[PDB]
Every structure is written in structure tokens, then in C-alpha cells.
Amino acid sequence: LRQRMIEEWEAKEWEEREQEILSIQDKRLELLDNALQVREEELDDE
């Protein structure tokens, strides 16, 4: 329906929120990966 085409754009904006969540998780996970590399390096050195 014509109104559904507004609802589908609501869904599109929800997908945009999903992309924002994806980006936030990407940043946090990259930082965590770096931390894991740091801990493993220190362990190997010791």
C-alpha cells in the first residue's frame, strides 16, 4: 500500500540504526582485539 511505502522507509531507518550499531561494535571489537594482542605479547615475552 502507499502508506506501507512510508513504513518500509521506517524499516530503512531502522536498518540505518542497525548500521550505527554495527559501527559501534566494530570500534569496540577492534579495541578489544588490540588488547588481546597486547596481553599475548606480554605473556610471550615473560
Handedness of CA 40, 42, 43, 45 (dihedral sign): positive
The minimum distance between CB 28 and other proteins, in angstroms, equals: 8
Distance CA 35, CA 43 (A): 12
Residue 19 or residue 29: which is nearer to other proteins going by CB?
29
The minimum distance between CB 26 and other proteins, in angstroms, equals: 8
Spell out the long-range contacts of 37-45 with Cβ–Cβ below 8 A and sequence spacing 24 or more: none
Q: What is the contact mask toward other proteins in residues 11 to 40, using x (rule: CB under 8 A)?
A: --------------x--xx--xx--x---x
